[PDB]
Subunit: 269 residues, 6 copies
């Protein structure tokens, strides 16, 4: 890929946003599928349709034009993405991840990512919440990477490390807060693997992914994390296990919303 | 992202339906060396890929592909003699273009065949492997014929692939194979597709086998994904033309010979199976 | 799919052939931090990549690459000081453009070197790993310098890659290392290439190791594939500059010395 | 080669028809400084170009265009406030996208207005010129919104342009103008379109006049061609905001322009009652 | 800068040379309604454009073009039945691809024909206009089949175009027209090419006429330019099928047959 | 085409040049075909190949790669282009004109453009030097313009005027300076018309162009002038009439080059500021 955005594009978008809202969030949240209801938990919200924001990719699915919402979650100023972009919709990664770099320029310091995923870990049950401790970037293995192209030093280094991508401290807080919520099910934890999609996996692919050490599978999130870490954002996230993948040839969403809301109090600064 | 619009598929289907009175219910994509299947076909009417509107055109000089409509074993079908591969430069939305056209022609079942390298230790050159499942390596990185906005007139946004290879046809393939009475048993397994065109290193071969792959090739998977997305029943076979070497210690005319004989066997197998396809 | 036509490779080769009287028999691609190999050349003649027709141009500012012709250790060769990477935005047909040009110049052997992360826990920082085999992850998805119609004037449609790293040179590499009487042993293993530019997560590292990989990098494999397709003998090394995270320089000069020594073991 | 397929136009039309109850019969493309027409419209409903599926988005940072539906003077209209130009980088198939959408909405007449430079020596700043014909310079080189395979559902392969500007509306324009009781006559002439964005050199101005042109601009023609191709009745005007320089050797000009704009706006409103059906 | 590389042309030429034994010395590009010239051709071998390697493919539905080799009037030639136009979406380097292939086949003379609108008021519907010169409007803005680095194996960087339409053939055309038994004079003039697909407004027609144009169309010029660049002898005609509107104020089937017969006769006048 | 270069690209190229040379040119000269010898006669010259300069378009003709040369001409520091880019070679105008914007960022205030052209005016003879008083941009009529695309306000306005593109003062000084030279032939003056190329004109086209009011015809320069005026550069230039265009259907260099070169050197002293 040849990242089509120039440094000034990001600046223009950030400048437009900074002049259209007086809010200055320190945390950005990307709402996964069916988790958009999180925006309704914000107070003093101001919304911007993706379509009106300069340089912003526009939603694909008809009748579901995305929105960027600035607001207060749990005493914390946030900027949230209601609706996201996926590689399977035809968006190259430099477009899918455009918002992450804009957030960095707005002054955001932490990125919370959430998604709905397929459970590969045999212990997982539909409705479980999995704290993402690590990921496997399959598209990245072949070069499909949002960082492809000459490096923009104003954002980060040429070869950013990913071994510490999911903040270790937030991990501990996530477990503490979960116990405070008193759930019948434990807080799951593990590796998220991303693949292109849009078709779901065959049985042989699921077995293969599980042996790769993956716990949950999806078609997003990884590109955003890579860009976030590259530009210095702290990151943490969760996968909502909406289905158990088929391994043989033979509500929960509100809980996650509450969980993310409570964790706002655990984000540094 | 797919460059064809819904009406492009319709225009091609309309062109074909107006140029032939045949109305096939089954489509067959012949792999390499299985091109002889077109013979054995009766009342055949041929269209060179090059003359069909919107149809991708062959790459290998002197081997322009052809779409042939004819009767195989009393069953009307349309066959692809020569196919398209990612390694030739075609994106998957072009490689799989014909599959959606077939659906629009009224086809309800797609039969896919190919030549593949054997990964399973029980496999021998000349074996025929019923495809029970597949591993789409290109799909892992986003190279997918379904990439782009979803066309609901074909299928859903997130089509399932766990039951891609028809279970009923699998049972019929096994019973038919027995009725054929062959020296070798009908193998069965997972086909893994990778880009090509170079063949694998020993390390890649060991890796693929560990992934659970039984046969390796550079086609078929894309077609199957598109077929399932638009509702086509699918079943297919891999002709094992060569055994892959799994180690460094281990150090041809007979290999080619075993391949040609196996190919004739696959042709008869596919012909007999026509009677087993429902409807 | 490859945007260069056969005549483009020829035009570039002729330009070089008419701008230098040297006729290299060996080509060397210098990995990261190994550019110093060029200084060992004598009778050196340099050409900036930027001035050579059809040649891709470096991306990192202040580090414009160069093609240098000269004698290393009694052998005529052409060296690449600075390389091209997929992570930089180049499609493989551009990354490997030079390999086909070298073949047209008359080169018969290609030496590939690179810096890599150590996956095999036996490797220590500074170790040299003779490349015995490779795993082309980008190739699994079709990202291949050979993608597109085949140019028979270079090679066959389906080149074999199982015998990519010359067995003879691998034996001489081991014999030469012992003759040098080095304290540390000469490592050997499988090199796996992934796109980059980010480094691996712990999960990816564990995965790659289980795939049978000993060293990981973001180059070399494309050039090797193209080299073998057009008939070049191939051998190379990874300089293990770091041990990848598996849980939650005199070394470079030694490689440069070793590669220089092996020039004498190259046939013809 | 057009980048939109027939169904893209239908999608946009369907979207609009399901987001407004207004059913326009006439479309108005407002020229530079003529966006005030949108005011004086009642029962108005606005859509930013940015939110409309497939619609090109304005380049000029600061004035994101919008589509406005409403009743003008007894007629249901859809108006473009903000336009697209070739000089901005839009290929003609994007510039004219709205025209085909309008036809699919049920629009039967297209009114095009623009600000233009005066080539006719008799023209004065503030004059309003009924467009009687045009000269498509970009079309001479193949830059044409119709380039590519023809879409028969819109129109024929070789559309005629000799009768592009409706003769009946031309008579209606002169009648309505006369009734308004204006002292300055309603000018009439040929509009020539060129790419832009730079203004003409003296040599170019003379050349243009010798070609038979009365006014020069960088828009409108592409739209008129697409409109006639899909069967829309067309008529329009050029507001002469400046006299081009013809020799090698202001507040009043601005004023005459401002007043002429208001005048053209009133003129178009009145003309709504003379549109057939 | 032209999508095709020299070897692309060679491949196509080789394909044709190995699929037919005929070796044409002349090539004819049939205009609108003049495809019937392919008939009255003996020992004809036809190839659909679609099957010929690198050949552009027709856009008009149900009218797939074809290349036909055969003897016309004692001369071996290759004819294009159906052509390519910029208004259809083809860049000029594609529209003119066949011309360079013809040169590589051994063709020495190119006969171009087309249907055109009459600008010269002296012209009447059905008239045949010998092309004496042309005006390349798309060329004024850089839209040219020769745009890009020059391929010397074909021609020079800056080819002259003032002597594009062979003087001798034009003189031969006027002398041969006699035996056509036509009571109508053989017209002659300047052909002006513009993009299309829409027809001219009144103002454009008056303008084109004042430019010195006698007939207007949407083709031919790109082919002539490439033909002259690679050294081909060029000869051409426009069939005036309509008189453009110059103010706001069955027969054609016979006219085409007339041109076809005329072109056939001229075969005997082509040198060598 | 809406121009593929971003503002920062021009800045990057200017910064690179400014850090590789200490010279601060106030004048930029684009040498036409056969006028390349102007680079000589330049003192304290520093040269840069187009190929090594970041973002710089590269020459197409094999064996003759272009160079950017910085030096002193006649007491005036300047930068010259030896080798140019033409639309007929495949370059879009945003590439052809890239150097002009870089010059502006380098601190250049005046652009001198020269070229070889065909004479349309019956009074011109081969070897005549024609001061460009105005131009006709044929490609511009159809939209082929280096300014196509969103306007970059940091360079100039959206609708720049071109009625006064060729500096009147320099034109007056050119005629006065020519006098001093005491040449036999007079310094011609006229309208330059730009066509795409690469083929030369037919008789019909030549007659057409003359009727359009053109005095000389060529395939360059106009784009550079348009971009120069857009970013506020003072402009003046000349066409060396290398050939006389044929207008009659019946009808069957070096020398002036050096002359134009010494003339341009002389004019350096007349350039303001
Ligand atoms: C489709 C959904 C992800 N997603 C949910 N379930 C699955 C599954 N079984 N397999 C794959 N490959 N992806 C799955 O997207 C949710 P997101 O937008 O929040 O990432
Ligand atoms: C090249 C052949 C497939 N094909 C046959 N053998 C192999 C092998 N060992 N490795 C790979 N990667 N592909 C193999 O194509 C046959 P198809 O066109 O019928 O798929
Ligand atoms: C970045 C460097 C390669 N390279 C060096 N270390 C690593 C590492 N840990 N992981 C990956 N993926 N690549 C690594 O490139 C060196 P080359 O240009 O000589 O290939
Ligand atoms: C710039 C303005 C048109 N426009 C106004 N005056 C001129 C002029 N002198 N020359 C050219 N070429 N165009 C002119 O656009 C107005 P529109 O958007 O309503 O067409
Ligand atoms: C459409 C036809 C040309 N063609 C025929 N009549 C006209 C006309 N009045 N105006 C224009 N611009 N073109 C005209 O093409 C015929 P050809 O394919 O033989 O060139
Ligand atoms: C080819 C030369 C220009 N050039 C010189 N003479 C002519 C002529 N008669 N017609 C056209 N169209 N161009 C002509 O280029 C000179 P430059 O590079 O200095 O512009
Ligand atoms: Ca938008
Ligand atoms: Ca786990
Ligand atoms: Ca075709
Ligand atoms: Ca270069
Ligand atoms: Ca439809
Ligand atoms: Ca939009
Ligand atoms: Ca008039
Ligand atoms: Ca050759
Ligand atoms: Ca074809
Ligand atoms: Ca360069």
């Amino acid at each position: 890929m040849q990242n089509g955005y120039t440094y000034e594009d990001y600046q223009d978008t950030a400048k437009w946003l900074l002049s259209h809202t007086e809010q200055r969030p320190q945390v950005a949240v990307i709402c996964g599928s069916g988790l958009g209801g999180l925006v309704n938990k914000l107070t003093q919200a101001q919304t911007f349709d993706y379509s009106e924001i300069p340089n912003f990719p526009e939603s694909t699915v008809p009748g579901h034009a995305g929105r960027l919402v600035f607001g207060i979650l749990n005493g914390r100023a946030c900027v949230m993405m209601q609706g996201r972009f996926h590689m399977y919709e035809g968006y190259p990664f430099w477009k899918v991840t455009f918002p992450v770099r804009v957030f960095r320029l707005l002054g955001v310091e932490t990125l919370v990512v959430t998604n709905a995923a397929g459970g590969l870990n045999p212990n997982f049950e539909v409705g479980d919440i999995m704290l993402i401790r690590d990921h496997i970037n399959l598209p990245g293995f072949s070069g499909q990477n949002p960082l492809r192209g000459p490096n923009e030093e104003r954002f980060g280094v040429r070869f950013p490390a990913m071994s510490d991508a999911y903040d270790r401290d937030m991990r501990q807080k996530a477990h503490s807060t979960w116990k405070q919520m008193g759930e019948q099910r434990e807080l799951q934890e593990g590796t998220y693997v991303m693949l292109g999609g849009p078709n779901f996996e065959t049985v042989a692919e699921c077995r293969l992914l599980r042996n790769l050490g993956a716990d949950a599978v999806g078609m997003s999130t990884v590109p955003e994390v890579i860009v976030a870490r590259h530009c210095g954002l702290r990151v943490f996230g969760f996968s909502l296990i909406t289905n158990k993948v088929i391994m043989d040839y033979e509500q929960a969403a509100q809980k996650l919303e509450q969980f993310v809301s409570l964790l706002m109090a655990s984000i540094p600064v």
